[PDB]
Amino acid sequence: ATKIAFVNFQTIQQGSISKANDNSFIKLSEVSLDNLDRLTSYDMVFINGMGLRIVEEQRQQIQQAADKGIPVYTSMATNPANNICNLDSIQQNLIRGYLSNGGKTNYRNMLNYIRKAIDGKASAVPEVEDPIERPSDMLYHAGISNPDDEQEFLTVADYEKFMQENNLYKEGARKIMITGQMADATDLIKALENAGYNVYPVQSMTRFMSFIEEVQPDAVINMAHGRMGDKMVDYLKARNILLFAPLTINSLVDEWENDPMGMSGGFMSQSIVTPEIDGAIRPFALFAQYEDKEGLRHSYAVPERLKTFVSTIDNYLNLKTKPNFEKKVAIYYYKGPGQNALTAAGMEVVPSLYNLLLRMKQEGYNISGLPANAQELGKMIQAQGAVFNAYAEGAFNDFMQNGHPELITKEQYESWVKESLRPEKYQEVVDAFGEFPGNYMVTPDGKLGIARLQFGNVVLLPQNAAGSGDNSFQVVHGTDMAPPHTYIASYLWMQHGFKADALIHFGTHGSLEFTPRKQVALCSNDWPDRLVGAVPHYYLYSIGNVGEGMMAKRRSYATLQSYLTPPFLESSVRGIYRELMEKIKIYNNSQKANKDQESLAVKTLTVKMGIHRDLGLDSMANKPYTEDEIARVENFAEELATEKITGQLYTMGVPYEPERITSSVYAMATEPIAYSLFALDKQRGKATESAEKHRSVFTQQYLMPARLLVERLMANPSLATDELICHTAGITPQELAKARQIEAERNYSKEEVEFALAVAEVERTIKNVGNYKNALLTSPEEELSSLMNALKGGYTAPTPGGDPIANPNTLPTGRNMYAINAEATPTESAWEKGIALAKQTIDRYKQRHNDSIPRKVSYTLWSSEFIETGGATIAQVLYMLGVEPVRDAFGRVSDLKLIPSTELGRPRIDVVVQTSGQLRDLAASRLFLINRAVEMAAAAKDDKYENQVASSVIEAERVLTEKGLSPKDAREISTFRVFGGANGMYGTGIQEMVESGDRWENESEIADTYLNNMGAYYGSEKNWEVFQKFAFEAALTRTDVVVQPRQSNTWGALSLDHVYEFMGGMNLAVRNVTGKDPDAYLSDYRNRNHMKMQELKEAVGVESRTTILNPTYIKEKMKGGASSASEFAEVITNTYGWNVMKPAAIDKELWDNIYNVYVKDELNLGVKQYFEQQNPAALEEMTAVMLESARKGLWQASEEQVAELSKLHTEIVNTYRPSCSGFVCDNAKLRDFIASKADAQTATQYKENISKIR
Template sequence: MRIIFLTIDGNHAAALHAAAARIKTEHGVEVHAACYDAASLRDESGWQRLERDLKGAAFVFGARLFGEEYVRPLERLLGAASCPVLVITSNPALIRMTRIGKFSLAPQAEESGGMLRQWVKKLRPQGGAGEARRQLAVLRNLSKVLKLIPGKARDLYTYIVAHQYWTNSSPENVYRLVCLLIEAYVPGYKGKLPVLDPVTYPDQALIHPDAPAPFATLEEYQKWRRSLRGNKRVGEQGSVGILAMRTVALSGNTAHLDALVRSLEARGIEARMAYATGLDMRPAITTFFQSHAHGKAKKGAPTTNGHAATVDLLVNASGFALVGGPAESRPADARAALGALDVGYLAPVPLAFQRVEDWRRDWAGLTPVQAALSVAVPELEGAADPLVYGGPTAAGDGFVPATAEVELLAGRIARRLALRRTPNHAKRLALVLFSFPPNLGNLGTAAYLDVFRSLHKLLVALKEEGYQVEVPEDAEALRNLVVGGNALAHGADANVAATFPVEHYMRLFPSYTEIEPCWGRAPGELLNDGRRFRILGRQLGNIFIGVQPPFGYERDPMRMLMARDAAPNHAFAAFYTWLHHTFDAHAVVHIGTHGALEFMPGKQVGLGADDWPSRLIGELPNFYLYSVNNPSEAAIAKRRSAATLVSYLVPPLQQAGLYKGLRQLKDSIDAYRQRPDPGMLDVIREQSAKLGMQQVNATLQHGVGEAHATLEVAPDTYLAALSHELLQIEERMIPAGLHVFGQPPEPVEMVDLLSLTATFHQFPLRGALVTFPELIARSLGLEYAALRERLTTDLEAQAAWQRIEGLGKDAIRRFVEGGPFHVPGLHHRDLDPLADFLGDLLNRLSSDNELTGLLHGLEGGFVTPSPSNDIVRDPSVVPTGRNVYSLDPARAPTAQAVEKAERLTNELLARAVADTGAPPESVAVVLWGSDNLKSDCEGVAQVLALMGARPVPDELGNISDVTLIPLIELGRPRVDVVVTVSGIFRDLLGHQMRLIDKAARLAACADEPLEGNAVRRHALATAAELGLPLEEAATRVFANAPGSYGAHINHMVESGSWEDDEQLSETFLSRKGFTMGKGGEWNDSRPLLEKALANVQVTFQNVDSFEVGISDIDTYYESLGGVTKSIEHLRGERPSILVSDAVSTGANRVGSLDQMVRLETRAKLLNPKWYEAMLSHGYEGAREIEARLNNTYGWSATTNAVEGWVYQGVAETYALDDEMRERLAKLNPHAAAGMVRRLLEANGRGFWDADEATIERLRTLYEDLEDQLEGIGVAQA
C-alpha cells in the first residue's frame, strides 16, 4: 500500500521511511511511504509524480501546508483523491479536504447531533486572521476530553489524536501515527498493527546534540552540562540562545542545528538551544533565556518585570516568525518579547521550499514563498542576518548543514557577542562614508543627511560613552581631516589613513582569484601603487572613519550585466579585508543611504557564504544609518549586507512659497481678480512670458471638443489655470536643508509638516471621519471636495482654499508655540482628537532617539523595529533611531490600495486621452519597490486595474491570486501594460511580479473580442512573429538579471560617456530585458521586451513620495527616462510621458512629465528658500544643489522634457551671479565647477540654446574654477 505525507518541509521524511521499514520488519506489512514537501513540488515533474501516486494511495496525511502556489493545486488533487484524507494545521482550504470514515470537515458535510455536532463545528475552518491559533486551541481543548468521545465518533477521535502524534512528532510517534492510519482506514488491516497512544514531550525544552533527551527546565540542563567532562571553555566567550521548531527537534532531523551548536562551542560560546511550538516561541524565551530573580541586569540588558536576559544574543533558527510560525504573523507580540529580552536578534534561514543544491544554483536565492515567510516576516519582528545555513538535499531524507555558511554564521555570532562583552574603551569601530559619483566634491554622500555634522555629533556621543576617540573641534575640521590631510600628496580623493600590502590582501582574502577574471590581476587599477592599496579615511583613536571605494564600473555600465564572474574590484575587497583583519573592527557603521556593499553581485535574498556581500562584510557586525522613508533599499541593506538598521529623519518639509517674479505674477492676478482691468492683462501676459509660464494647461469647453484658453478668448479661465500653477509651486512641500543625525528639528520648523499630515489623515467628528481642512471648510459653510474639483478653473475656489489652509496652519503654529489649539468657528470638542494626534506626533518628532538607538545596538542590545515610510503617510515611523522594516508582502495589494489604484487608473486613462486623442492600447509602467512598499502596493494594483484584473485574497487574508474583470463590468477595453521593475522590486516583491504576470497571461488567453483586449491582440501577434507559445508571448514583467541593479543610464549621463540616444536605449534594453519563468528560472528575453515596448503610446510612473521628487534622485530619469528613450528608439517617436504626484494640489494626481519638471525646478532649484537652506550645510549643501542640476539634465538626455529657461535660470542664479558663484566655490569648488560644466554640456548637446556671450562667459568661468581646483590660479569674475 502507499501512504502519502504532505508537508511544507521534509523534516519527517526520514522518520516516515523508517516507520515503513519498521512496519515491514516487525509486522510483515509492505508500506510504500512517499513524503512530498515544497522542495519536491517546485517543478511540474514533482506535481505529476504526486498526481500519479495519489491515484493508488491508501491514505493521505497533510500538515503545515501554506503558500498559494501549493494550496490551490493540492486542493484540486486532494478533492479528486479517492482515499481517506486527513489534514491538520494548514490553510483552511486544505483542512476542509479532511474526510476519514464518517468524519468530514467539508462545509456541506452532515454533522452528528448534540455535543459531537458542536465539536465538529468548532473544528471546521473559519478562515481569516488568527485561524491557525484558533484551530490549535480547539484541538488542545478537545484533546483533554478524548476519553469522553464515544466509540461511534471514532473518526473524530482519530482526527484529534492524529494532531497529538504530529505535534509530538518524534520518529516513534510517526511510526505510531502510520500504524493508526493503516489499522483504521486501510481495508484488510484491522487488528494487524498496534495502536498505541502518542508519546508526549514538554511543550518547550532545552536540547543538545549530546544530550540523551530534552530538558524541561534550565536547572536540569545546567546540571547535565556540569556533569560533562572536558570542553571547559564553553561559555567563556558568552552565551547565545537558539530557538528551533518543536517538530524539527523531536523529529531528530537536526544535523544543521547540531553543526551550528558545535561550531559555536568550538569558539568557547555556550549554545543554549531550545525548541518551542511553531506558533509561539515566547514561552521558551521566558523559561530558558531570562532570569526569574529580581535584580539589576547587566549593562545592555535592561529588565522588564525583573526578568533580565541570561544570554547575550538570540538566534531564531526555525526559519519562521517568532510568534505565528508559518501560519500567521503577530509581530507586535514578538517585538514586545524581544524588547523585554533586549539582546541582538538574528534569524538565519533553514531551507524548507528548495533543496540546498537548487538554492546554490539559483541566482534569485530563496523562492518567493520562503523569502516572505523566512525573511520578510521575521524582519517585522526586528530580525537581522537571513543567511541560509542548511536544508534538505536531493540525496537524502534529512536536513544537512551548509558547512561554509554555518561557519560564517557562527563567526558572526561570536563577533556580536564580543561586541556586547567588550568594554567601550576597548571597542574599535569603523564608520564608513560613501562618495558617489566618485570625486572630491561628493565625499560623504547620503540621502537627506549632513554627513560630517552627523559624524561629529556621533563622535562626541561615543566619547561620552567611554570610547577612545579624538574628537575634532567641529564638523568642518573633521571634514578637512578626512577630505584633506595627505590626499594631494597621494593624488587621492581623501586622506590616506593606511596602506595595505597586496600580498597581505591576497593571503587574507583568497577570493581575490575570482575577482581577476573581471578586473585583472591583483591589485588592479584602483587605489594602489602596484604594491600597496590605499585605505582612504582618518583614524581618530579607536574610531576609523573610512571612505568606501567606488564600484569601479561607473564608466562601464554593462560590465556587471549578468556575467557569472561579475565581482567587486580589488580595492573594494581590500578595504573590507583591512577593516576585518588589520584594523580588527568590533563593528562597522555605514553612514547614510546608501553605499555599494549591498548591491554587489550575488543572490537576491537568502545569501550564502560565497555571495560577494557575504564575503566582503564577513563576520563583522554591520550597523547602517538609513533614511526612515526608504523601505525598499533599507530591506536590501538588511538582507544582502547582514545589517541592523538605525533610522534617521528626513529634513522637515516646508512649503516652497513664491519668490521674485512668481510672487509679482501672483500679486498681479490677485489685483485683477479684485478689480478687473484690461490693462492688467497685458502686465500678466508680459510677466508670465518672462517666467516661461505663458503656456498653461487651460482649456475651454466647447460643444464639439476642447480648445486652449487664452487671455484674449477666456481670461478668467486662463488666469485660474495660471494661478493654479502658482498655487502648486507655492504649496509644494520641499525639504528644509539636510538632517543632522541625533538632532531633532525645532518645533517651529515642523508646522508645514504637521499641517500636511493633518490634511492626509482623518479624525472622528460626530460619527464621521474627516481631515483637518474638511473640518475647517464645514465651519465656513464650504464643501472641501467641491473646492478641490474647481481649483484649476475658479479663482474664487482658490481663494477659499488658501483661506482654509491659512486658518489650519495658523492654528497649528500657535499650538506648536505652546498656545491652545483653536480654530474660529469650531468647538474644542471637535478639535480634541486632532490636538491629541498632533501633540503626540510633535513629541515623537522631537525625540532624540537616533544616537541612543545606535549606541544601544553597539552595546549589543535590541534595536527596536519600526515601519519605514513617509512621515505624512505613516506617522508611526517616528521616533527614528529604530530598525526599519517594510511590509508583509503576502497581504499586498490591500483593499485600500486597490480602491485608490482604480481611481488613479481612471485619471491616467483620461489624461492619456487628453494628450494623445485616443485611449492608449499599451502603457509602459515603471514599478519601484519603495513606492509600492510605502503604499501597500498601490502601483501593482494600478497595473492590474489597467489590464482589467483585480487581486483575490485567500482564506487567511493573504493576496494569493488574480482574476479578470469581465469586459461588460469593466466598461472599457483592457490595456496592454508593459512593466519594468527595479532590481529592488524584483528582490522584495516577487509574489507581486507573479500576480501581474498571471493577469497578463489570463488576459492573453481570454476568449474575448480582440478589439476589447489589447493584451491578447498584441500577444497573438508576438507569438506568430517570434514563434512562441501564447502564454510566453504574453510576458509583461521585465527586470534586471538576478543580482544586478539599475539600468545604469544614470552612470552614462553623469559621466558623459554616451554618444547618441541609441546608446542609452541599448543599455536600458540590455539590462532590463530579463524575465522570470514559471519555475522561478530567469531568462534573457530582450526580443520580447522590444516587441512589447514597440506597441506603447504612454509611459507612466508614480512619484509617490512626499519627500522625494523627480529631480532629487537620478533613478527617476534612469527608469522612466530609460524606458521612454527605448520606446522612442523602437517606434521613432516619443510616447506621452505621465506621472502621478502624491502631493498634488487639486483633484487630479496625474500630469505630464514636462509639467512636473517645471514644478520641481521652480519649487527647488531656482527657489531661494530651498537653495539657501541647502547652502547652510556648506560643502554638502552645495553638492546637493549640483546633484539637482545633474538630475534635471538627465531628464533632457532621456526625454527632452526640460525647457531652455530652466538652464538659463540656473546659469543666472548660480554661475553668472558673482556673489553666489563665489559662495559655491568656497564651500565646494568641485560642485561649483561641476555645475558650470553641466551647463556647457547642456548647450553642447542641444538641450539649451544659449547666446554666444553667455556660453563664452561660462567657458571662462569654468577654466577659472578648474585652475582653482588644480591650485594654479583663482577664480576670477
C-alpha cells in the same frame, strides 16, 4: 494490498514514514500536484496543507475524489478553503494523534490502523495501540552515553541537576537560550559548550516566556517560524540583550549554491520578513540537508558555516565586557572624485563626523590627535583621504608621496586571501585585473597603497569603486563583475590588519550590499558575505529611504540606526504672483454677458510670466481663453503658493532653529485636518462642489481655518479635549463614541466605515500636536545615546519607515526599521486607490487626444513606493487588464478572477512592466501573478468590446517571425511582459553613457544600449533571468503612455538622478521603436488623503519655480557648508539628462533663467562669493554642464552667453585648480570648445592646468 498516496509532503518526513513501515501489504506512493486525476485508484489519500498553493481546478479534482468514496485527510491546512476531509470524528482524532506527536512508534501503528479500520480488509495485521503523547513544553538534551536517545525535562531545576551530574555546568559562565523546531541543532549546542557557555534548549510553542524569566539568559537564538510577539519585545528592552535568527535550507548543499534566488514566497516571509518586527539580527544561513546510504534525507549544520557563526556570537558578547579604552572601530564614508565633497542623504557630513568623535572621546574611547574644530577636520580629509579616477595618473602619483598611505606587501595579501576567500572566486579577479597589486596606486617596489586617517584606536577610510572604468557600456551576458584589488584589500585589512571590533557605514548609501550574486540566504561564494566576516556591523540610515535599507539588513547583516530629515518651510512665492491672482479674481466676479476683455487681461499676464508653456496653452494675439482654460491657470498658481520645500541640511547632535521647529509642525498637521473635514462635509451633503473645482476656495474654507487651530494647540497642548474634537468636526458626542468602536474591531455598511476613518484622522492628529514639537527637540540627543548603547552590545528597538509628513510614527529616531509582508498585497485599501488612479489616467488621455483610449500602458516599479502604499501600483496594472485578486479567510492573495466585459465598460488595455533590483528581492511572487494575469486576459473570448490584449500578442508574434525566429519560439516569446536588468544587476547602467558626452553622437546609439541592458525576463520561476534577442523590442510596440510612481516629500523630478534613468530611458526607447513620442504621467502618493495623476512637464515647471529660481530657497541653502553647495551641481546635471531623453520637456527659457541667476547674479544675493568659500568644485561642474548643452545643440545659446560662461570657467580653474570629474578632465571635445571661446593668452594657461593631472 493497501495503496496509500502522499501529496505535497516534505522529504524528511516522507522518508521517516516509509522507513517505519514493516507490513508487506502496505504500499506507499507519491503524487504530484499536476497528477490529481489519478486519485481514483487509491484506498487512502494524505494531503499536506502546510503552505499549499493550488487553483480552483486543482481543488475541484480533490473534491471530486472525496464524493466518489475515497477516504481523504488534510493535515494542518493554512487556508481553510483547502481543508477537505470525509472521515468520522473518531478517525480524525486518531490519525491526528499519531501524526502530530511523531516518532517511529506512532508512525508504524498508524499504517496498521489504516489497513484495519479505514480499509476494512483486516486479514493479517497485529494489534494496534493508542498514540503516544509527548510533552508540549519542556527542555531537552541529547543523551551523554547514547546521543540517539533524547532526554526530556519539565522544570528548570530538573535540567540544572542533570547538568551537574554530567559535568556540563561551569561556574560564572554566561547563559544562552535556544528556541525553535525548524532544524536539528545538536551540533550547534555542542559547539557552544566547547566555547564555554551554559546552554538551555527549550521547545515550547506557546508559553516560552515562563522559561525565559526563570533563567534570565544573556542572549537568545531562535530558529524562527513566524513572530514571537510584543511580550518578547518588552522583555528585551527592559533587559538590554540581543536576539539572533539563523536560517534553514530544505535541499542539498550543491543545489543551494547553484540557485540564484535562495528563498521566495511564503517560506521567505516566515523565516526573514516576520522576525524583523521583533528586532532580530544576522539572518545567517546555517542548516541544510544530506542524503544517507539508503537514500533518506537528514538535517545537519554545515561544518564551515558553523565555525563562522560561533565566532560571531563571541564578538557580540565581548562588547559588553571589554573596556572602552581598548576597543577598535572602523568608519567608512563616501566621497567624490578629486576635490568633491562628502555626501549623504540630507546630512551635513563633515560637521556630523566631528560631533561623533567628541562624543566617543567623552565616553572613554582612546581618541588622540583630534583637530581643533570641524573646519580643520575637513582639510585633513582632503589631504589624506581622497580618491581618484583611473585616468588621473598624475593625481594619485603625487598622493603616494604626500599623503602617507598604508602599504600592503604581497605576503600579507596572499595570507589574507587564502584564509577568507575561495580559490575559484579569487581566480575571477585575476582574469579581469591581473596579478597583485594591479595598476592603481602601486609603489615601484610592488606594494599597494590604502588611504586612511587614524586617531588612536579609531580609523576613517573612504570607499573605492566596486567596478572597472572600462568605458564599455554594453553588459556581456553570462559574466559577473568582480571588485578590483584595491576594493578587496581595504576590507581584508580591516579584519586582519587593523583587527577591528566594530564596523560602521556613515550615511545613505554605499555599494557593498549590491555586489553579486545571490538575493537572500547567501553562501560562501557571495562577496557581501565574505568581506564582512564575523565583525559586528552598524549602519546609519535615513528614515525617508526605507525601501533600499532592506538590502543592507538581508545581504550584509547590518543593524540600522535611523536619523532625521531636513526641516520644512513654505515657498513664500505668493507675493511674486499676487498681481496675476487679482486679475483672475475680477474675472470670476464679473457678471457681464461678454467676459472677453477680462479674459484678455488674464491672458496678457500669463504669457508674460511664461506660464502658458507649462500648461501647454496658446499665446495667440486676440483669442481670449475659455472658461475651462482660466480654471487651469488658477489651480496652477495656487499650487505654487502652498508648496513645501526643504531648508538647511541636518547635522547630528544639533536640533533645528526655533523658527524651523515651528514651521515643521505646521507641515505635519495642517493637511490631515483640512482634508479629513472636507471628506466629512461631502458625505453629509453640503455645498462642497465649489471648493472641489477651485483650489482658491479650498484654501479659504478648509486650509486657513485649520492653520489657526494648530497654532492654538502648540501653545496650550492641554486644550485637546473631547469637546474640541466633537465641535471641530461638527458631530454630537454619541457619534464620536461609535466611531471609536469600529476602529477597535478592525484593530457595518461601507458608508459607516468611511465615516469612522475620517473621524479617527481628526482625533489622532489633534491629540498628538504637542508630542510632535517635543519629539523634534529630543531626537538629536537620542540618536547619539542609541549609538553608544549599541557599541556596548545593547538592544535597538524596532520602528517603521517613512518621512515624518507621510508617517508621524517614525519619531523619535535611533531605531531599527522593518518592512511589510508581500504575500498580502495588494491590500484592501490599496485596491480601492489603485482603481481610482487608473480611471484618471484614461480620462486625462481622452481630453488630449479627442476621446481616444490608449492601446498599451507602460509602468515602472520601485521598492520604496511598494512598502509605503501597500502595493497601489500593482492594483493599477491589474485593473487595466480587467483582472481582480481573490482573498482567503486570512487576507492572503493567491489567485485571480476575470472581470466581465460588461461590468468593465471599456475595452481591455495591454501593459508592459520594468523593475529595479531592489523590488525583485522584496516581491518576486507578485511578478508571477502579473504575467499570469496577462495570459488570462489574452484568452478571453466573446467580449462586448474589443480585446486589445489579444491584438498585441498577434502583432508581437508577427515582428518576431520577421526577425527570423522559429514558429515555435515566436509563439512562446510573444507573451513576455516583465523585464529587468541583465545578469541580475540592480540598475540600468545608462547614466555613465549619457554623461560621457564625447563618446556618442546620436540618440539611436543610446536606445540600442538600453534595450540590451534591460532585456532580461523575470516573469516566471522556470525561466528566471533569461535573455532572448528582440523580446524587449517586440513587447514595446503600440505603446502610448509611460507612468512613474512618486511617494517622497524630499525629492522631485530634477533632484533625484534615478528618475531620468528609468522614466527617461523608457521614453527614449519607445520613441525609437514606434516612431512617436508617448505621454508621461506621475503617480503622486505624497498626500495619503489625496492622490492624483500629474503631467511630467507641469511637474518640472512647479519644481523650478519654487527651488532654484526662488530667492527664499537660495538664501536658506547659503547658510550651510560644502555638502549644501553640492546639491546645486546635482540639479543642473539632471536637467542636462532630461534634455537628452525627452527634448520636448525642457524649454530654452529654462536655460536662460538659470544663466541670469548663477552667472549674472540677477537677484543680488552674492552667489559667487558663497561658492568660492565653501565648494569651488561645484561651480566648475555647473559651468561645464551648461557649455556641453550648447556644443551638442540641446541649448540654442547666443555668442554673448557662451563667451561669458567660458570666461568664468577658466577663471575658477586657474585660481582653485581643477577638480577632475568626468566633465572637467575626461572630455576632449569639450576642452577644445572652451579654449576657442576665450582669449588666446588664457587658452594656453587653461590647457596646461588640465595636462598636469592627466
